[PDB]
Scaffold this active site. Structure first.
Site, mmCIF file in Angstrom:
data_model
loop_
_atom_site.group_PDB
_atom_site.id
_atom_site.type_symbol
_atom_site.label_atom_id
_atom_site.label_comp_id
_atom_site.label_asym_id
_atom_site.label_seq_id
_atom_site.Cartn_x
_atom_site.Cartn_y
_atom_site.Cartn_z
ATOM 1 N N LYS A 85 0.780 -1.231 0.000
ATOM 2 C CA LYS A 85 0.000 0.000 0.000
ATOM 3 C C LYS A 85 0.810 1.278 0.000
ATOM 4 C CE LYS A 85 -4.164 -1.986 1.031
ATOM 5 N NZ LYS A 85 -3.993 -2.019 -0.452
ATOM 6 N N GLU A 107 -9.763 6.214 3.364
ATOM 7 C CA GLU A 107 -10.643 5.217 3.948
ATOM 8 C C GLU A 107 -9.760 4.010 4.190
ATOM 9 O OE1 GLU A 107 -10.237 5.223 0.628
ATOM 10 O OE2 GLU A 107 -9.813 3.095 0.376
ATOM 11 N N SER A 375 1.892 -9.589 -0.429
ATOM 12 C CA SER A 375 1.468 -8.213 -0.233
ATOM 13 C C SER A 375 1.839 -7.564 1.110
ATOM 14 C CB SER A 375 -0.044 -8.095 -0.491
ATOM 15 O OG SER A 375 -0.799 -8.965 0.337
#
Ligand SMILES: O=P(O)(O)OCCCc1c[nH]c2ccc(F)cc12
Ligand SMILES: O=P(O)(O)OCCCc1c[nH]c2ccc(F)cc12
Ligand code: NA
Ligand code: NA
EC number: 4.2.1.20
Lengths: 387, 258, 387, 258
Positions: A85, A107, A375
């Site tokens: 991210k 969010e 990830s």
């Protein structure tokens, strides 16, 4: 718009009219930025000297013993922040500044995108407020403290089901009146155009590094690259550079929860109906009445009730395949990676790992070169996986 | 046509239109019907009805609560169309516009949704999350079923948007009083020049003085929702005071419309 | 012995006679390994493709605004595992195998060395048992689960004060009877020779990368490199390559706890007396009677009651300087790095940061190029720093 | 000299030496003195005394507990030397060896520690964590103060170690029965060839049969600690049964020594 907002029949910009100028300005900024060398340099520098790129490509040594499967892990768990991210929030933050925006709206479901936004915000001098489902805030205190610790205002939402989807709504509501000085830093490759395109472009270094790294280590492209799919950012980040390499299989893994037949899952792409929500036309979890539902999964980060438009599209044309992994399968792959490779994977990424393990175990004599996108790291899941 | 006539009588009699908005099924099906009858009885020139949606991204707390209240009552889209038919049966001439969210109309098939609207006697449909650039399929289905496709004209509207909403809309043009979302706690020129349907101003209208201002500004009327829904909210335990208070607000608002 | 076991007057091998053959075999293995190209290649490969080396060197952007101090952070917090400890356990694990050892013994205070040993053990196929002060085990459940999760047997010690020092003793006791098949993976640059030398050599890539990285980014060596000093592994890892560069200042920061004058600290190097313990002659926390005491600090990882021999020696000859940082100063540097650089540092490394901040704030007009060794990330300290 | 005489009488009278070990101050100063008097009275040929240390890395649980028990009693090194002087005063001929940990002797200065030993009447000092390669300063101080520097000969001892311990030691050579640490729950040839001080076997000796085995093997005697300390441990609440049981074990052990 300068770019096509649709992937086949999926995509679009289904947002209140008031927000269209904001989206159009965002797409403009992005397009110019992409051609701006000073922008690329700045982004690259942050990725390398601050985030930790390029991440390693680790060949599993023990996990595949006894089979003809060669498994490699793209180490995004080694990215500053603990997950992939970070890549894109850095780029979106630079874009914000490029547009002269001073505040950041975001969010977050599990908190990972929240933390990533807070850290990029703190670093780049942007005020940052995060919307989180009041329910999630309470189940993710760690990530919450982290966010506040970094100076971000974490706003819990009690409206609706008080989960990711309800947080996504508050962000748009807020942005509806603040697009003026605030920028909406969407967390995944979904939502209204150009987010699905922007996020993919800002996460594409994953697949580009992987391709270069495997070519280096194995002298050939993998047979398949696998990635979990919550909203689609990590998956599309990994897929992007391999799409034209038709020999390379692209596999997306959605959370199967307690099992598809159970109804308690988070696999809308393969078991949901196309609908219109969160500013996009795409498959989702909804009632027969058209009401939006929540995705369920042992892993909080795969609970986006829909999926990215480019994934629904890659599936329809048969370029990528999507499967699901149950809670237990993900849990087993989590324990297996810890005990045999000394790597604690995020429960999210465990879904991708679990499938790779399935491909291997089911046909152990099959010679295959697989690449799983790790990830994130699972430090955050230590307690849950503990109980 | 129903809107046409309403605006004929209104302007003709030099009067501004007052359009209350409420959520169908809030706080309950039966109470809702009574509430609407009181709105009309109290002087409502038209009705703006919302059907309970799970993710109303264009609504502030007041309305969000209304939807939750509605859902709590077990109200569904199918049940909303039932109330709609029943309402039209009691009030043949009052214009009825629907405030919808894209997925609710896209669910069963876009055309099918408008066919049902036509069958029930609905006059217009405004889809909150469908901008002019994504409206093709929605207005075409509306036109095909004689439903007025309502479009929103925001403050940041350039000339291009203005020409599109003036050319695609019918019934009336929804003039956004401001940005943000629905909340009681918060162009007319060019529109006329382009032949846009009578404009109705909305968002934040709660003062009877705001209505005179709107009509004075050149708007054909004003829509007020949160202000009305709040009255429902507060008197939630006294059905009687709910209607009494409701009646008084609308009369004042309507009164301030001429 | 093949190498000198003393640094000036500090060092030696003060262990029961029974353990000397083990130490001598360990030193032999190390010396040959260092000359073994296949060994270097294997070690390097693991560091790069599995651990994540080289780590980044991040220039702080906001932290130093308004002063003439340029601060850089060596990002060991970006190392697989979350701390610098990973570097050396990988090398010691390879050494173990080189010696044909099949089991691994380790001691851990805060749990970081424990986790690092477990992960390298799991990866390299070694059975691993960790000794932890029964007290620490209870205050570090997270790291404990992590260790078990990775298949390591975590043994809590209730003997003595049930802290690091008591865990170190059990490890030697155990090794006393098992040196046969087990290898003692000491966690810091202390203990009997050749550990202080082995650990430094297996942690020296830190300073070597830093030197190459700063020369690249600034075209000159820093004015000073700073590092916290619990036992000395991260500090000496950073110092090593700069020792002959006399223009470069080496600063070690010991935990000042509630304050030196308070008695509740962990700064033996500068406020302890030379003694003999844990197989070495070095300054330590001991009573006037000669009884060994515990080091105190807000950060659990800086509680080794002594210090590495090469540090006590570098100090005596004036090559390196050692200072102390109090709990509150470390806490303030922790919050400051989070809020202004979006990096959560380990409470341990915060001590090093705090001092760099002091050098800067005290003489803001002083032009200085400083490098702090961010030994680890502070995810582990999130709760404590929360209260 | 005291050890010399002990071994003269012993071997002369074809007898093996039994040397009990206990921690000074365990479980309390007064009880400790009584315990030692009982050991001697019961037939102990010599004494091996340990002074409470905080980190006894060469000791198993039994002894670790003894030290903790001692510390619990407030016993300190200074208090140990007091008991030592008092003990020597009651028993002029019995050899007394000290089991120390390096830091306790290094604290006040190595030479000073041995001077105090000499002053108190101690015969030998074995420093658990000081191997022959690090003993220079320790044996020199011992020699200078007429203290016998005791060295350990382990199972994995090569010829080189053997020659060093035979050449540096005095009083007796400590023969390690096995590896690991002190625990009741668990070369003599070459030593003699090299003229090493009489060997005493230690670690795991708890069976009176083990003593005969030791002396039979060629050892001049055996040291037993955990076995003795356990008796103290179990009868911790009955001082009387503690001494009675203590007395019986030693007599049996001593008995098995001839
Ligand atoms: O009085 P207020 O501000 O609650 O306005 C309500 C106007 C009618 C209304 C209710 N929900 C909406 C969602 C979108 C939109 F464009 C208009 C509305
Ligand atoms: O009976 P056992 O096994 O407890 O032996 C005790 C022997 C005397 C003894 C007590 N503590 C020690 C530490 C080191 C060392 F070399 C010997 C001893
Ligand atoms: Na999803
Ligand atoms: Na220390």
């Amino acid at each position: 718009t300068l770019l096509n907002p649709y992937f086949g029949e999926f995509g679009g910009m289904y947002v209140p009219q008031i927000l269209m100028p904001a989206l159009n300005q965002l797409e403009e900024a992005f397009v110019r930025a992409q051609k701006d060398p000073e922008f690329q340099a700045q982004f690259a520098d942050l990725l390398k000297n601050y985030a930790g790129r390029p991440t390693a490509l680790t060949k599993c040594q023990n996990i595949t013993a006894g089979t003809r499967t060669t498994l490699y892990l793209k180490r995004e768990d080694l990215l500053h922040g603990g997950a992939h991210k970070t890549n894109q929030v850095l780029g979106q933050a630079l874009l914000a500044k490029r547009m002269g925006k001073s505040e950041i709206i975001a969010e977050t479901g599990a908190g990972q995108h929240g933390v990533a936004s807070a850290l990029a915000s703190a670093l780049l001098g942007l005020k940052c407020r995060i919307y989180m489902g009041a329910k999630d805030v309470e189940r993710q205190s760690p990530n919450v403290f982290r966010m506040r610790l970094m100076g971000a205002e974490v706003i819990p939402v009690h409206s609706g089901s008080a989960t990711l989807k309800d947080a996504c709504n508050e962000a748009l509501r807020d942005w509806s009146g603040s697009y003026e000085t605030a920028h909406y830093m969407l967390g995944t490759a979904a939502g209204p155009h150009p987010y699905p395109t922007i996020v993919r472009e800002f996460q594409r270094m994953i697949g580009e590094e992987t391709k270069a790294q495997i070519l280096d280590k194995e002298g050939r492209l993998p047979d398949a690259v696998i990635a979990c799919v919550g909203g689609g950012s990590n998956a599309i980040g990994m897929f992007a550079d391999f799409i034209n390499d038709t020999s390379v299989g692209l596999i997306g893994v959605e959370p199967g929860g307690h099992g598809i037949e159970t109804g308690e899952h988070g696999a809308p792409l393969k078991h949901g109906r196309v609908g219109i929500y969160f500013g996009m036309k795409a498959p989702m979890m909804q009632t027969a009445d058209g009401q939006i539902e929540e995705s369920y999964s042992i892993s909080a980060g795969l609970d986006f009730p829909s999926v990215g438009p480019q994934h629904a599209y890659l599936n329809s044309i048969g370029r990528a395949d999507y499967v699901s992994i149950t809670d237990d399968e993900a849990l087993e792959a989590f324990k297996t990676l810890c005990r045999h490779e000394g790597i604690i994977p995020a429960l999210e990424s465990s879904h991708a790992l679990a499938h790779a393990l399935k491909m291997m175990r089911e046909q152990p004599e099959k010679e295959q070169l697989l690449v799983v996108n790790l990830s994130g790291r699972g430090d955050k899941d230590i307690f849950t996986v503990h109980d | 046509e129903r809107y046409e006539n309403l605006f004929a009588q209104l302007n003709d009699r030099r009067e501004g239109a007052f359009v209350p908005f409420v959520t169908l099924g809030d706080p309950g099906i039966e109470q809702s019907l009574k509430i609407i009858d009181t709105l009309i009885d109290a002087g409502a020139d038209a009705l703006e009805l919302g059907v309970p949606f799970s993710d109303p991204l264009a609504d502030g707390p007041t309305i969000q609560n209304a939807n939750l209240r509605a859902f709590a009552a077990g109200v569904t889209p199918a049940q909303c169309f039932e109330m709609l038919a029943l309402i039209r049966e009691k009030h043949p001439t009052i214009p009825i516009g629907l405030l919808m969210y894209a997925n609710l109309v896209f669910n069963n098939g876009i055309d099918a949704f408008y066919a049902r609207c036509e069958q029930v006697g609905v006059d217009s449909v405004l889809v909150a999350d469908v901008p002019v650039e994504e409206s093709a399929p929605f207005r075409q289905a509306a036109l095909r079923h004689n439903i007025a496709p309502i479009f929103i004209c925001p403050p940041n509207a350039d000339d291009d948007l203005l020409r599109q909403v003036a050319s695609y809309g019918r019934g009336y043009t929804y003039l956004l009083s401001r940005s943000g979302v629905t909340g009681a706690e918060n162009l007319i020129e060019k529109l006329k020049e382009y032949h846009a349907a009578p404009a109705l101003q909305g968002f934040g209208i709660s003062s009877p003085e705001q209505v005179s201002a709107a009509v004075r500004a050149g708007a054909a009327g004003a829509i007020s929702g949160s202000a009305i829904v709040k009255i429902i909210e507060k008197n939630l335990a006294s059905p009687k005071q709910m209607l009494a208070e409701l009646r008084s607000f609308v009369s004042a608002m309507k009164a301030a419309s001429r």
